[PDB]
Amino acid sequence: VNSFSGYLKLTDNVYIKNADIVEEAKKVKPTVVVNAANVYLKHGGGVAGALNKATNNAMQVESDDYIATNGPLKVGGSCVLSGHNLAKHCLHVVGPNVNKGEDIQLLKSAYENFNQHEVLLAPLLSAGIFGADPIHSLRVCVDTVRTNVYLAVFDKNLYDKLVSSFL
Ligand SMILES: C[C@H]1CN(C(=O)c2cccc3[nH]c(=O)oc23)C[C@@H]1C(=O)O
Numbered sequence: 498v499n500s501f502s503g504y505l506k507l508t509d510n511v512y513i514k515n516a517d518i519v520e521e522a523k524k525v526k527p528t529v530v531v532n533a534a535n536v537y538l539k540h541g542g543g544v545a546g547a548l549n550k551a552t553n554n555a556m557q558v559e560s561d562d563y564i565a566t567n568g569p570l571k572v573g574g575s576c577v578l579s580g581h582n583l584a585k586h587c588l589h590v591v592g593p594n595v596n597k598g599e600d601i602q603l604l605k606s607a608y609e610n611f612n613q614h615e616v617l618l619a620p621l622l623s624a625g626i627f628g629a630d631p632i633h634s635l636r637v638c639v640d641t642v643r644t645n646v647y648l649a650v651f652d653k654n655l656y657d658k659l660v661s662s663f664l
Contacts, residue, residue: 499616500525501647507663510645511638515656518544518620518649519551522583527647530580531611531619532556533627534589536569538576543626552581560589572599573606588614595628604634608641616645625651635659 504512514521522530533544538560540549549556559578570576575590592607593599607622621638623629631650638646650656 499645501527501618504647505660507635508639510643511648512646513635513648513650513656513659515651515653516649517547517651518618519547519583521647521649522548522580522618523551525618526584527580527616527618528585529588529614529617530584530586531617531622532587532589533620533622533625534570534575534591535594536572536574536591538564538570538589544620548583548587551583555579555581556587573603575607575610584618588617590622592623592627592629592634595623596626601629601633604629604637605641608638611638611642611646612644614644616647618647618649620649620651631655631659632662635663 504514506512532548540546540557570591572591572593575588578587580587590607590610593603604623611617621631621634624631624634
């Protein structure tokens with residue numbers, strides 16, 4: 498039993514809710530919240546900008562130190578950093594950004610990072626300003642993640658479409 502509430506069950510291990518991931522993190526304090534990161538951990542907009550804003554920019558400060566030490570992430574890769582006031586940990590995962598011309602096949606590699614964590618609160622990777630089709634992202638999620646994932650979808654219209662079209 499866990500504290501996630503109001504989710505629709507899509508499969509044995511994947512759940513979905515129309516929710517603001519920031520507000521959901523603030524209420525649940527999950528062990529892991531996933532950020533929709535880029536390779537530079539520059540949290541300017543989309544999910545990343547919202548999560549970082551909710552930490553009063555502490556996520557960005559920590560991220561800048563991480564990059565100064567380690568260099569950029571790989572597209573499809575991840576790193577574990579603090580969850581600040583939102584979660585125990587933040588798993589920063591880089592899905593391909595279609596608006597940068599990155600290979601969409603890397604979306605499966607990106608979701609594989611979730612399997613290193615038993616339970617996660619997450620957004621759909623590569624959705625939103627990353628330019629991928631969220632229906633496809635949901636399909637890859639379901640077909641790749643084996644651990645327990647609670648997906649927060651900000652847009653109610655998109656949420657309804659994702660549910661109604663789910664196979
Ligand atoms: C397509 C993504 C983009 N996105 C946000 O940008 C966002 C998330 C939480 C709070 C916020 N306040 C704000 O102004 O923007 C946000 C959440 C969407 C999703 O994952 O469904």
